[PDB]
Amino acid sequence: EDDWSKPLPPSERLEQELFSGGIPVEATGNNCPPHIESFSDVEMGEIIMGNIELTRYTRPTPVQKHAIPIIKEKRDLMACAQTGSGKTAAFLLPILSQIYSDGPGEALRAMKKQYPISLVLAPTRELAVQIYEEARKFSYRSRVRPCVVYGGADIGQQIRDLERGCHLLVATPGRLVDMMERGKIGLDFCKYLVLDEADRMLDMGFEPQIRRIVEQDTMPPKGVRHTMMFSATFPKEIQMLARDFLDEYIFLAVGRVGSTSENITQKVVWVEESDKRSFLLDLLNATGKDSLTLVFVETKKGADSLEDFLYHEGYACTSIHGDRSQRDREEALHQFRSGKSPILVATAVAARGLDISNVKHVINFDLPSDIEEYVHRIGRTGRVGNLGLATSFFNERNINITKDLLDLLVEAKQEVPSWLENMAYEHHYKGSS
Ligand SMILES: Nc1ncnc2c1ncn2[C@@H]1O[C@H](COP(=O)(O)O)[C@@H](O)[C@H]1O
């Protein structure tokens, strides 16, 4: 049989291809394996150590010091770390290491529809490619062929890439489901599940697809598969997702766990329904050359009406809602992402699963009845380096979220309209006399 631990012949055109480019730590859980200080503190194999040297990694990052020995000891992981912490290599290195050591497993040898040994789920195309490229570096001179798929691109070329073999699959949840329904991917032998930037995936409304992939198909249950979740923040829906997806897991926090709606400037203004169009025009006239603007409306009839208004007023824009054919919605998303139509009108429901690459300005033309939905919507702007802007139109129709919105603005240390805190005021708490 095949030896998956002993490296394949090199290829320096491929080497130049791959490798010629540019404080507190909390760990809680039961029987947590001790952290490492060097990559050699645990045995990650011949192939991994060789590829580590090609990538010129000299010392493990904080998150790698703790996560790598955890994953290698086959323990589930909930990790709160931010971008630039080296979390990609933190799960790729021990996973690939174990695959080299263990091999494909008797199933894939008795067969040799693609069956990934490892699956990494990402919110966006950009992050998906980042993970994919790192995987190529560490799968070099091995028999693990990494593949990446994502929406907004030709599925035909992605299917072709898949059929050349994939043992590690990086995917956005929507395109993976599409591959599964088309019968191109099976999860029967997926032993390594990774959710990278899980919080943003839920922001973009990927949770149903994720739970369909993990819980409703053929993927091994927890305790059999090894599952790792990485998230910058730790809101309640992530905690619930962690409890459901993880078994006997270690909680790792590198730095302070990020706040909800961080890196976002939020403005709330009072606008009557009749004035929302004109008010929007003033907001659009304070827009840069092409900074992408995402406008949320409640209904599809409202979306069409708004776009019709914007078109007549001379604005380059497009729309995405349910009453559109799929050919129109895919082209609309293409024209938004390319800046040809820098203004996207969309209902929240239609925006779900779409790779809208965090715009510079989110405008809540209509506010939701739900503050958790508000958090998901404004999450469509703001990163780490780029401060995002979220402007919301508020009137009597939104009175039910007055207090939650106020509380959120205060927690995020944002500006509060004096009329908003006035409307939220409760005389019960003043006291007698
Ligand atoms: N051990 C390491 N030494 C040096 N750079 C690293 C290490 N691990 C990851 N990186 C870099 O950190 C970035 C990855 O950030 P992240 O988004 O946390 O995966 C990439 O630029 C990597 O090259």
UniProtKB/Swiss-Prot annotation:
Coiled coil: none
EC number: 3.6.4.13
Alphabetized GO MF terms: ATP binding; ATP hydrolysis activity; cadherin binding; CTPase activity; DNA binding; DNA helicase activity; eukaryotic initiation factor 4E binding; gamma-tubulin binding
Localization per record: Cell membrane; Nucleus; Cytoplasm; Cytoplasm, Stress granule
Record domain Helicase C-terminal: where: 263-424
Annotated consequence of substituting residue 87 to E: Complete loss of ATPase and RNA-unwinding activities. Loss of HIV-1 mRNA nuclear export. Does not promote the translation of HIV-1 RNA. No effect on IFNB1 induction. No effect on RNA-binding
Top-tier EC class: hydrolase
Keyword Chloroplast in record: no
Annotated effect of mutating residue 278 to A: Impairs phosphorylation by TBK1 and fails to synergize with TBK1 in IFN-beta induction
CC annotations in GO: cell leading edge; centrosome; cytoplasm; cytoplasmic stress granule; cytosol; extracellular exosome; extracellular region; ficolin-1-rich granule lumen
UniProt-annotated stretches for the region Interaction with CHUK: 7-29
Phosphothreonine: residues carrying this PTM: 287, 318, 391
Biological role: Multifunctional ATP-dependent RNA helicase. The ATPase activity can be stimulated by various ribo-and deoxynucleic acids indicative for a relaxed substrate specificity. In vitro can unwind partially double-stranded DNA with a preference for 5'-single-stranded DNA overhangs. Binds RNA G-quadruplex (rG4s) structures, including those located in the 5'-UTR of NRAS mRNA. Involved in many cellular processes, which do not necessarily require its ATPase/helicase catalytic activities. Involved in transcription regulation. (Microbial infection) Facilitates hepatitis C virus (HCV) replication. During infection, HCV core protein inhibits the interaction between MAVS and DDX3X and therefore impairs MAVS-dependent INFB induction and might recruit DDX3X to HCV replication complex.
Quaternary structure and interacting proteins, as annotated: Homodimer; can bind RNA as a monomer and as a dimer/oligomer. Interacts with TDRD3. Directly interacts with XPO1/CRM1. The interaction with XPO1/CMR1 is dependent on the DDX3X nuclear export signal motif and XPO1 interaction with GTPase RAN in its active GTP-bound form. Weakly interacts with TBKBP1/SINTBAD. Directly interacts with TRAF3; this interaction stimulates TRAF3 'Lys-63' ubiquitination.
UniProt remark on domains: The C-terminus (residues 536-662) is dispensable for DDX3X trafficking.
Name of the protein described by the UniProt record: ATP-dependent RNA helicase DDX3X
Source organism of this protein record: Homo sapiens (Human)
Lineage of producing organism: Eukaryota, Metazoa, Chordata, Craniata, Vertebrata
Gene expressing this chain: DDX3X
Full-protein residues shown: 133 to 584 of 662
